[PDB]
Design an enzyme around this catalytic site. Structure first.
Site, PDB file in Angstrom:
ATOM      1  N   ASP A  68       0.959  -1.207   0.025  1.00 16.51           N
ATOM      2  CA  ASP A  68      -0.086  -0.007   0.094  1.00 16.51           C
ATOM      3  C   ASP A  68       1.073   1.310  -0.093  1.00 16.51           C
ATOM      4  OD1 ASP A  68      -1.956   1.948   0.249  1.00 16.51           O
ATOM      5  OD2 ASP A  68      -2.438   1.463   2.424  1.00 16.51           O
ATOM      6  N   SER A  99      -0.608  15.508 -11.909  1.00  8.73           N
ATOM      7  CA  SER A  99      -0.923  15.369 -13.284  1.00  8.73           C
ATOM      8  C   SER A  99      -1.106  16.464 -14.180  1.00  8.73           C
ATOM      9  CB  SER A  99      -2.077  14.426 -13.530  1.00  8.73           C
ATOM     10  OG  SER A  99      -2.652  14.112 -14.811  1.00  8.73           O
TER      11      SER A  99
END
Length: 330
Positions: free
Chosen positions: A35, A199
């Protein structure tokens, strides 16, 4: 040193991936959920409340000659999905894919929430976010990667998650045969303890690319892709009959639909998520309403590039003094 381990989807939807991890001496192999959005290595154990164990493999520290109680240490964690676990702490030897760390903090669960009990395939979590998020008290502990870093050939790990197929976690090297083209690296902020990046935009299907900054986290422990409501609405508007259902808890779409791809930007590069990766199947057995793999982050507080996005890429988690993330197509 290096390590390399195969990671395997737990079910036919790729809801999560499990990776075998050797703990203790002799080794006890547990299948852990790696994770990158958390920083605790915790396991089902001989100390876990018996009624909260249902098929998981447990770590028994009393059977490990290298286990040592970390005196006074406790841990307690709550995840973004509402699940939680807590317990005490041992140090022990932990190996992943041939890479061994001695003295790793292994957080032994005394209590786990129902979602963990109900998932017999996940024996615990191995956190790969920054150690500032580790929950051990009163002395915070380091992640497996942080403990291994100095010994690694290069201070990196890579995630190569498969679509409906096994993939690979590598530590200490970048497998140049595992991706196509080049890896585009992008800046990371560690201020929240995550692999947080920006992004450069998105496209829906064959549509034009929209240049817009989307801050979010690279999170292998989250199944879906959670993005701003504007972006998610633009995606699902291209699927006839798709709608946000308050009763189901997100966007659903007719199972008869063909889904468009979704592209996200990494600098000037582009990662394309095929439409099929966005199908999470019937909302309940036999339903013709299917659950979408791109969902709004509006209620989360952060955008999350979970498995839906990451499995479309070869992803480099560069833990150099100034960390960065790399993405390549594959």
């Amino acid at each position: 040193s290096t390590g390399s381990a195969t990671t395997t989807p737990i079910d036919s939807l790729d809801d999560a991936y499990i990776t075998p991890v050797q703990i203790g001496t002799p080794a006890q192999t547990l299948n852990l959920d790696f994770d990158t959005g958390s920083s605790d290595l915790w396991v089902f154990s001989s100390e876990t409340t018996a009624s909260e164990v249902d098929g998981q493999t447990i770590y028994t520290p009393s059977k490990s000659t290298t286990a040592k109680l970390l005196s006074g240490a406790t841990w307690s964690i709550s995840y973004g999905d509402g699940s939680s676990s807590s317990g005490d702490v041992y140090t022990d030897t932990v190996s992943v894919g041939g890479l061994t760390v001695t003295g790793q903090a292994v957080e032994s669960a005394k209590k786990v929430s129902s979602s963990f009990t109900e998932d017999s395939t996940i024996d615990g979590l191995l956190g790969l976010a920054f150690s500032t998020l580790n929950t051990v008290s009163p002395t915070q502990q380091k992640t497996f990667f942080d403990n291994a870093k100095a010994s690694l050939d290069s201070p990196v790990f890579t995630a190569d998650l498969g679509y409906h197929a096994p993939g690979t976690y590598n530590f200490g090297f970048i497998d140049t045969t595992a991706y196509t083209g080049s890896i585009t690296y992008t800046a990371v902020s560690t201020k929240q303890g995550f692999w947080e990046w920006t992004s450069t935009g998105y496209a829906v299907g064959s549509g034009t690319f929209k240049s817009t900054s989307i801050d979010g986290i690279a999170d292998t422990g989250t199944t879906l892709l959670y993005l701003p409501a504007t972006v998610v609405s633009a995606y699902w508007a291209q699927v006839s009959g798709a709608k946000s259902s308050s009763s189901v808890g997100g966007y659903v779409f007719p199972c008869s639909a063909t889904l468009p791809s979704f592209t996200f930007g990494v600098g000037s590069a582009r990662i394309v998520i095929p439409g099929d990766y966005i199908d999470f199947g019937p909302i309940s057995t036999g339903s013709s309403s299917c659950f979408g793999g791109i969902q709004s982050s509006a209620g989360i507080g952060i955008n999350i590039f979970g498995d839906v996005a990451l499995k479309a890429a070869f992803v480099v988690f560069n833990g150099a003094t100034t960390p960065t993330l790399g993405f390549a197509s594959k």
